Design a binder for this molecule. Structure first.
Ligand SMILES: [Mn+2]
Ligand SMILES: [Mn+2]
Ligand SMILES: [Mn+2]
Ligand SMILES: [Mn+2]
Ligand SMILES: [Mn+2]
Ligand SMILES: [Mn+2]
Ligand SMILES: [Mn+2]
Ligand SMILES: [Mn+2]
Lengths: 388, 388, 388, 388
């Protein structure tokens, strides 16, 4: 209708998304490896704006300097050939067995130091490629057992690491900012900074908090049964939504990484409504895995579907908010009053206001319906294109 | 052996715990109401240190001033008769139908103002009774549907409310501090500030953050599938564990409020280990419900079991930490190294250290086992009293 | 468009749905009680086909015979006035404190006998009102602790109870059949027969299995994180879908009882697709609760929304299945081949078929993509009305 | 004390347990491959009774006949050298990419036929090695999307497959029986036969149901939030507990496969209590993964811990059941009455018994406490070795 993405829509994809070969813990690869150059070309043809990478997605672990230079050269040529951007990069601190107990919070100090050096090397590369955001997903930070990890000590180590990275970027005069990606579990039994809230709270204890925000992922918050739009709202309220990862998840299970729109469809609607109403200006990044049932045609169909679903939901959310009948229902439900200060008159005036206590008619207020069901059915009708 | 509590152990109980009449949404009351005086006497006989209350537990909603005075007088006499303390109090902003859409974040502004006045009245009472901590559980703050609640606006209202309460306590010269209690859901479909992390993050945006901490509850974090000891560790790391609620929960379901030790027993062990190792000095408060299957004899047995289980776990955790074989296993697993700074030498030294990158033997480090399973089996053996 | 229900659509509602007064465990009632006569009239005006009841919804517990007769007379007049039917009835074996440890599986034998007599009395009433199905939801059958309930003994008692009920209906020559409603938890910590599968398995051990089927509820299976359409498919496969309860649930939490279509919208789509493709001919019954935020206008809006959402989804699922492009995608994904016997040639022929083992080209088969993502995006486009 | 296993305890392990190399979806191997001969020797030294295998654990996929013969010969020599048994075997119908959409319920018919031939070949081997039980875990049977898999058709295919296998074993005169292993999800978004109940129900529709039972796994049922002891009780009630897999899981997340005793410790206690009270005579099989943090010393420690924890729990459960104070508490809680028939007098006598209805004192019965909390605290005290 026809919901066709173009680079102006700012849709981005990780190399590791469309490039996922399909290995799962009970299963071998179902697809051959993709050359990053091919991924860049195919994503551009679909209307993507850019790509993102872990160090080890772009440059095989253990590469020589000559190999590294050539991998980067080929990638840059593909970006130049297509007009694709690289808005974000990140470090792989989870695949190699050296990181089995963590990177920044490994019990082994030598591993912690190595993790920092590996990250710093890739920050330099990210800046060279034009990235504005550097993500950190501490997927190995955590434990399967209680004695293995003293979390206060681990948080001290995690703060030290992020503070050193902030010192580094400041010393180099780089404009790049960090986005910490929470996840509750998987691959560790419990992961440190398990939700958006825990990550937001941790950032406030860093030496230079302004350099750090969050990179929430739809499926990660949903793995804790949380409301992803609500958590995004809190991140926006805090001024900390530096990046976002979009995908689908069906509740509380392993991280499915379904295409965006799959999983909890209504949550996807309310997320798009929020991002668009708030004027979020960052990339709409997809961190998803085309299911291992698919061949490459299915990989590109799944990637296209991520963007299509965002655009359909954008249309429906805008129509919802613009509909005079919805605007009336929002007033009927007192969403306008929610946005007004409780006591701009000040504390003493509130204390002196008999209408707030002695003369408050509690039963009359209690009897007033909220009209939320009518409002929500208008929302459903807009999502489904069942208005009239 | 025999794990007998005394007031020196600082165990406290809400009036609403042992006083729960057994109504659930599919069920009528199974027990008669308890007079608070009787609860104070019976808890003291069990070795409790004190009790806590919502306003409406102590003074029936809608009471006259003469009725209020008499309810408080009788309660104070029972406290004096027994030596019981009142370390914490809180407001009921959830039972009355006026609070069906919230107290502090109700869409209706008049309800928000009333909620604040109801709280302020009870802060005065709490201070009169000697409470150090004032808990706020915003159980009605949230939504069942996406359009009903704009979370950025609701967080603005929530901040306004807590800021006004901080202004109030400061204006009165009170020493009392606030503890915000997160919960992910129930009774609302999703509750605002759903976890310890979200609450910690929110506090940092208040005008006087030093006045506010968290009151985490075992079962609430477990309703999001989170690791309660880990979340307590983050609260301790932040200096924000102002109070704690102890109970049991079996995973992801309705809030069960089982007695402490029930539900996730190993998590209970690691929690006690953490509180005791950290020297937490606040009350060990039980927010639990004796199951509705029980008569009053079972109510008091369940309350006694809360304290007994804490004391057993305290003994076992202390024995674990003191055992030279465990101390050796902790070193074998590099818990000592986790507690050492990563780079006290500083950023430039780390950047110049070839042992951290070019000359780091990644394969040798990767080959070193963590020895976590042996450590955890020593922990299991200590918990079960199966050492030798 | 405009998705208007009429009695021919066979939509039914429990009296306890629209009549829910809004009490939750942390909250008092937000709505006055509804007279069943009023509910019948209001539901008929919305286009409902009928209503269902627990004994105690229609006749207050403890009523005299004269009171009982009058309650039933008034209800029958309302049914006659409106043309509403009563296709299903059930017993309340959960609200009264006598049932705190169960009805049919109470540890107390006298309670088990009473539960059976209470049920039998209401079976007679159900038959008088024309009900074809008698539901049993054993919400109190289960435990909070391991020693409280020996499940083998409880299953013996549960079988005895259902066998006695089958003997009763057979002895009276009644045509009514039973539908057992599974639920995993709430109000008990764990409920016996927690899923559709457990209930199906139990039925096979009854003396007269043909008299018993299941009454699955959307939200109950989703409280165990299960796929409700899949479970319905297994019940249909077994010939045991005797009734169904439709509502919404957001994953793993307390039973929300949201209106149908809310909660997991895509699961609602696939459910409707399955019921309609299978030709399920039973009532489309809504077991839901208008949120306690609502006044009566919101109650009726929420009930109307249940039916509206079913009808929208019915339209979209039919359009999906009828679309030649979808029919082609289904063949591309080998749904046709799934429906063909694996080895109609028989075991010996399979054993002798070299194409099934020695000469099977495993790599060629593995390379063939399933094309499931394209199929699922066609399904999404149909659900959202985004085709063209 | 010291909880030392010996072969008489009938503890068994899969080759794939201790042999797990540590690959997870975000991580490469952390341990070298183990020769099955070495695993047999090391497990025997720990006091194991036997081992189990998938075809592809023992014989690399794609092996020639000469290679196959030699792999089996070496394995048999190790079994003979140690006295280890092989009580169970199974087929790998999940790792190879050909099985990406299933084995027995693959949409591709040629894959379904191949899956059956692969299984049949391994049934022959299992019988040669003396296995009594043949497990089937359909880990790839299921879907990520609704259109991909018609579950009624898939259940038809699954029944055909199991019926053909039953025809095969009967035709060969083998004594081996099948055990179907349910799992709710992972690696598929939803797996067919997701719980013990669904598997039990499916078996009743097979042509020769007596040949089939279940192989429940602790962590699988817990991935649906279900009570594993309750599900085992239902399997025992049905006469269908043909095998069992023991491990640990912390609730609703990816399948952790922790050592037995880890995860939900109290559920482990009640499971052991049930198996021992019921006289279950099958192997106590561990399907677990030593965490990838561990070296080989940690692998063997984790395996030893599985057995140790079973033996500790066995001791504590026996002591609980034998304690006269517990026996009294069980009577106080009416567990004796739960085990008595409800109405051995028959239906007519129940209908004629005024004590069951008109003269039943509902309030007196309701007032009687169940005494479950005292019983459960005795259970806790026994588990923790805190009696006296
Ligand atoms: Mn993910
Ligand atoms: Mn991500
Ligand atoms: Mn709670
Ligand atoms: Mn609490
Ligand atoms: Mn329900
Ligand atoms: Mn229902
Ligand atoms: Mn498993
Ligand atoms: Mn298994």
């Amino acid at each position: 209708m026809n919901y066709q993405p173009t680079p102006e829509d700012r849709f981005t994809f990780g190399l590791w998304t469309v490039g996922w070969q399909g290995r799962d813990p009970f299963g071998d690869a179902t697809r051959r490896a993709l050359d990053p150059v091919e991924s860049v070309r195919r994503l551009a043809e679909l209307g993507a704006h850019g790509v993102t990478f872990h160090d080890d997605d772009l440059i095989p672990f253990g590469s020589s300097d000559s190999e590294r230079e050539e991998h980067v050269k080929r990638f840059r040529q593909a970006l130049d050939d297509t007009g694709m951007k690289v808005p974000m990069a990140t470090t792989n601190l989870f695949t190699h067995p050296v990181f089995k107990d963590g990177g920044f919070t490994a019990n082994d100090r030598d591993v912690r130091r190595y993790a920092l050096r590996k990250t710093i090397r890739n920050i330099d590369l990210a800046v060279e490629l034009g990235a504005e955001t550097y993500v950190a997903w501490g997927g190995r930070e955590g434990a399967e057992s209680g004695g293995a990890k003293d979390v206060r000590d681990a948080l001290d180590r995690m703060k030290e690491a992020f503070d050193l990275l902030g010192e580094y970027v400041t010393s180099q005069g780089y404009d790049i900012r960090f986005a910490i990606e929470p996840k509750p579990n998987e691959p560790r039994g419990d992961i440190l900074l398990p939700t958006v809230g825990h990550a937001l709270a941790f950032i406030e204890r860093l030496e230079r908090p302004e350099l750090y925000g969050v990179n929430p992922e739809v499926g990660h918050e949903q793995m804790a049964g949380l409301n992803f739009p609500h958590g995004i709202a809190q991140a926006l309220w805090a001024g900390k939504l530096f990046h976002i990862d979009l995908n689908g998840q069906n509740g509380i299970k392993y991280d499915q990484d379904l295409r965006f729109g799959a999983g909890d469809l209504r949550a996807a609607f309310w997320l798009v409504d929020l991002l668009e109403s708030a004027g979020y200006s960052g990339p709409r990044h997809f961190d998803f895995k085309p299911p291992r049932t698919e061949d490459f045609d299915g990989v590109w169909a799944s990637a296209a579907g991520c963007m299509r679903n965002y655009l359909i939901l954008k249309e429906r959310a805008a129509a919802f908010r613009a509909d005079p009948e919805v605007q009336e229902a929002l007033r009927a439900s007192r969403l306008d009053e929610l946005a007004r200060p409780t006591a701009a008159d000040g504390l003493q005036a509130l204390l002196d206001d008999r209408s707030a206590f002695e003369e408050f008619d509690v039963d009359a207020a209690a009897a007033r319906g909220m009209a939320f069901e009518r409002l929500d059915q208008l929302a459903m009708d807009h999502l489904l294109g069942a208005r009239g």
